Structure formats: C-alpha cells, structure tokens
Symmetry: C3
C-alpha cells in the first residue's frame, strides 16, 4: 500500500507543497497582527511574488471596529493637542510579525515610528535604517515539518510608538544568482509590484481568529500562550540530506 500509485499521488502533492515555497509560482507573506486591550485582533496581509514593501499608517494600526483633529494634533506636535483624552483606547497594545512563504528573513525590515513617521531629531537627519529596524536576527525561526516561518513580537508601549506607524519590507529568498529584478526579469515583476495591496481583517478574539481564519487559510501562527498553529508537511526525500 505504501507504493500504491494513489499514495504516490499523495506524495506528489506534499512534495509540491514543499517545493512550491521555493518556486517562483508562490507568494511571500508578512502578516502583521495587532492586539488591542479589548482582546480583538486586526490583521494585515502583506504579499507579493518577490518583494513586499508597505507602510501601515496610524489609521491602519488602530482598532477600526471597536472605535479627531483635537487628538491628532497632540500626536503631531509636542503639546499641540486640544483633547481631554491622553491616549486613545484603540491604539494597539502589542504586535506580532509573521514572515512566511519563501521570505529571506535576512532582508526583512520592521521600522516602527511615531505618528509623524520621522526617525530621529529632524527630517534631514533621519536614517533610512535605524538600528531597531534591522530586526532579522530578533525573529524566532519556527519549523512545522518542512515548512519554515519567522515570528517577531513586542509591545507598542505608552510613548511615541504607542501612536504607531510601520514600514515593512522583505524579499523572496534567492538561493542562486539570477536576480528576480535582473533586466531580463525586472519588467515581469514590476508589473506585479501591487499584487497584492495590503489587506486587512478584524476578529473579536485570537481564539476565534485561529478557528475562522488562521486554520481556514493555513497561515502559520503562534498563539499568545506560545502554541504553534501551522500546517505541517513532513519532509520526503529518497536520499540523505547534509
């Protein structure tokens, strides 16, 4: 039965799943999970065939389901507000970044700023890559069978980054030399620079999100109690691997 052609059809499916990751036919993904004091979750899908590059502005990071200038002016300039509310309830408590598919985690950047998006003391001194944006080594490398994904979690806090904005970018891993934006390829990937624009959802709790979305879309994930929710494809190979 182990060598029945039907089983080998199953084998083909699972070899396909693992090889699809490295293939040019798959997407790379960054999912940004935002956790609010009300226990709800706002989720952003960032995705592209080869290169993810997105800004999540303040209005993208606050809770838009359990929900202005008087407050906004106070997070625009120092002491410039006219609001009796010091900190908006709907600003996120924590985040998790999940990088999955064929991401080269070494190319990831997660650059979290305050409301004005301006790093440092003034615009002409801003650095394109502040040290805290070089987050690659701080991701945790998770494995589920032959699948590999990466997580990075943290708190936004009660300071400037409690009114957050985020720039996120990552490249598809290239294990060989022909660049996915080499001149013979660039136009085909440039045509897909917006496949797909950032996409969001909201869920009342993490547990309900896991049942209705994480599991249904087979998105790799780690819960608050540190449980891996991810598909698992066991490795198939006819010969030893180094």
């Amino acid at each position: 039965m182990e060598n029945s052609a039907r089983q080998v059809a199953q084998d083909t499916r699972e070899l396909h799943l693992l090889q699809h990751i490295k293939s040019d036919q798959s997407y790379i993904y960054v999912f940004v999970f935002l956790y609010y004091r009300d226990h709800s979750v706002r989720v952003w899908k960032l995705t592209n065939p080869v290169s993810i590059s997105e800004t999540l502005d303040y209005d993208d990071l606050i809770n838009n389901v359990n929900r202005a200038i008087y407050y906004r002016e106070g997070i625009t300039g120092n002491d410039a507000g006219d609001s009796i509310i010091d900190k908006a309830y709907c600003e996120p408590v924590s985040f998790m970044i999940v990088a999955c598919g064929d991401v080269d985690i070494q190319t990831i950047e997660v650059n979290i700023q305050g409301y004005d998006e301006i790093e440092g003391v003034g615009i002409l001194d801003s650095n394109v890559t502040p040290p805290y944006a070089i987050t690659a080594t701080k991701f945790e490398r998770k494995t589920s069978g032959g699948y590999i994904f990466y997580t990075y979690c943290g708190l936004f806090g009660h300071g400037d980054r409690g009114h957050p904005t985020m720039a996120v970018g990552v490249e598809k891993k290239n294990r060989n030399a022909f660049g996915r934006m080499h001149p013979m390829y660039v136009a085909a990937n440039y045509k897909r620079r917006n496949f797909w624009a950032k996409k969001d959802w909201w869920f009342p709790t993490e547990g309900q999100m896991v049942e209705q979305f994480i599991k249904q879309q087979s998105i790799p994930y780690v819960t608050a109690d540190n449980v891996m929710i991810a598909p698992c494809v066991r490795e198939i190979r006819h010969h030893a691997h180094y």
Copy 2:
C-alpha cells in the same frame, strides 16, 4: 484642396494620434467598469507610462454611492458571519475590462479572488498566476480606424467571487529590444510608478456615462447592447503595408 497645407496640418494631427500610441509619450490604460443591479456604473482608471499594477479591493468594487463587520466576518471565514443579509445588494453584477493605449495584451493579468484575496486552499499553496488570471486570449480585439483596444466582460456571480477582489497588471507593448526597465531607463520609469494611482468615478446609468464621460474623454468602450463607442482615426500611409 486635398493637398492644401491646412489639410496637411490635419494629416499631421491624425498621424500624431496614431503614432502617439506607440510613442513613449503616451499612457497605457486599463479601465474597469463595474455594473450594479441598480443599473449604475463604478469605473476605475488604471494608468501608467509603461506598467500598470493595481489591486481593487472589495471596498473599491462595491457600489459606494447607492450604499459592517457583522457582514464582513461572514465573507472572511466560513460561517463566521453575524448578519441577516446573505449577499449585499451593492456587490457588482458584472464587469468589463477595457485595455487601451499601447497595451501589450499578451502581458495582461486579471486575477479575481474572493474577499480574502487568497487563491487556492491555503496561503502556502496559492499560485501567483491561477489559470483564469491568464486572460489575454479571452479579450476581444476591437478596432476603430487605426486604433486597437481590447475588452473582457463577465459576471461576478453569487459565490466567493460575488464578494470580489481584483489584481490587474499589464505592460506597454515593446516592439523592439531596449527594455523600458533596462538599467539605462529603469530609474526614469520607477520615478513614475505611481503616475497615476487608481482613480474612480460613478455614473447613474451606462447611457449617461457614455455621454458625460466615455465620449467626453474619448475612452474606447463597448455598450451592453454591443455598440462600439470609440474615437476613430483612419489610417494614413503613402505606401502599401504588408
């Protein structure tokens, strides 16, 4: 009178119009027309000098003139809704894609998904190019004098794609070898990657749209009864063409 310099000035204008298509000085366009049960039309202009790449999210495809989480959760995960409305009235009935200007129709992709934008059974198995996205050969090639344009129509239906999202991309035709993203050109076109961002309008009926917009902007179009509405520039040439 046929060889009066004034007539030759007219000739210059019309030769200009036909040659402008192939020139680097023109835009390529994809117009997405969305037809609602109320007979109104929402229209998206997608445009770029060399490379169109856009996502039309669910909120871009529904009728925003004749117009949430309780319903949205039901199209996010299976059986996860809390809405007495099964299908929103404002979801589009049908679409037409019009590709015009110097498009290379062979490079077009029209990738229509459900609300979650995720092709296939799970994110790690999604294909960047599902077979139904390779729509080039299904477009109808329309001619109006020397002008050429392409149309593709269809129904969204009452299933997952009745809650649609769309990725659309196409390149400008290059009849020669110097790529419009060759290293000596790439930076100049990269600087125009967002000339222009997707732009929308709404019209109460197709007939009123044709008078007030299709004709006024000289946009090639085909009505519901299959009538071509397009400018016509008759071909001018001093010698036979193969």
Copy 3:
C-alpha cells in the same frame, strides 16, 4: 577651546549632518503644502530613500478637517452636476512644493490636473509630460548654510485645476555613475518603494504649523511673507573649495 575634543565632537555632528544629505542613509522629501481660504494648511510628506512617486487625488488635496456625488458628477463631466454649489469652499487656494534632502531637482515633475486626471482632449492623446509638469527650472533654490532646498508655489485658481489632482515624482541626486537601480542595487531599493507611503497632517494656521511642526521636525520652509524657516549648518572644510 576651538580645538578641544568636545568641539571636534560638535564638528563631527555638523559634518555628519551635511554629508548625511548625500549619503545613501538619508531620505529625499517632497512636502506639499495646501493653503485654504480658512487660513488652515494641509501638508503631505512624500518620501523615499531614492525615488519619490505619488498621486495626490482630489480627496487628498481638499480640506478634510473644515469640511457628495451631486457635486462630484459636475467635476467629472461637463454640465453633468446636480449641485447648487458651483465651487466647494474646501478646495485649496494655493500650494507650495518643498523639495529637500538630496533631491535632484532636475528630475522633479509636478503634474497638476483637473478632477479626472486626464491631460489634454482625450485619454489616447494625453501626454505623460505636459510642458507645465517640467517644473524644475521654476523652483527657487534656497540655501541655509550648507543645506540646499527648492520651493515652487502657485495658485490653483477657479478653473479645472481648482478641482485638483497631482502627480509628483523626483529622484535622489546621483553625482556618480553607479545607478541606485542598477541590477546590483535594484532589489534593495525596490524593497523600499513604499518607505514611506504618503502621509498627511493639518494645522489651523501657518504660524501654528511653523511652531508645532516645521520647527519641531526641522523641515525647510518659506512662510507666506517670504521668511525662510530652516535649520542652518554652516559649512566646515579644511581647504578651499572651487
């Protein structure tokens, strides 16, 4: 005291500030200031490490603090409106473009259109670069110590461009030959194509904006009475300069 190591630390800071402009580690910026009849200002930050490319649509250019189809249809097609309001109060009176950081002003384009974004008489005749979009030579070159920035101001008026849309793009100055989108570099900058998406603020008056934002973020600026508000870093060099 002039050669105390503490002073030389100050010298290092200021040499850093001037050299940071030309370094790959800085951003380029275009700020678009929009001035309304109510004396308020809406401000857009456009920014990127190497290449700015943005559309400011009509809803981005009108006053969204001191604030539809019946009017919108009238600026979509000629005489197609159903509004008793001829011109919306919230459309901007004037603009100023501030290009700063290491911009190559020779690559700037400021293309202002009417509501439909369509240059010329019809879409197939639109030019990607209308003459008025080649604004480089019309900018005023401002200096503040070793800093250089560029301003361009004007009125929107009471015609088509009184219902404005804008495409803006500019490249980082490259004083040498290795292109920032050369094949060996392109993927790293493509990954940052959306660092950062366009970002806006609003201020009740120019004077309050200058105190709470222009000065706080050290953004180069020129007020309505023609006063330069900009940081100043005096040039430091140990030898004569040509």
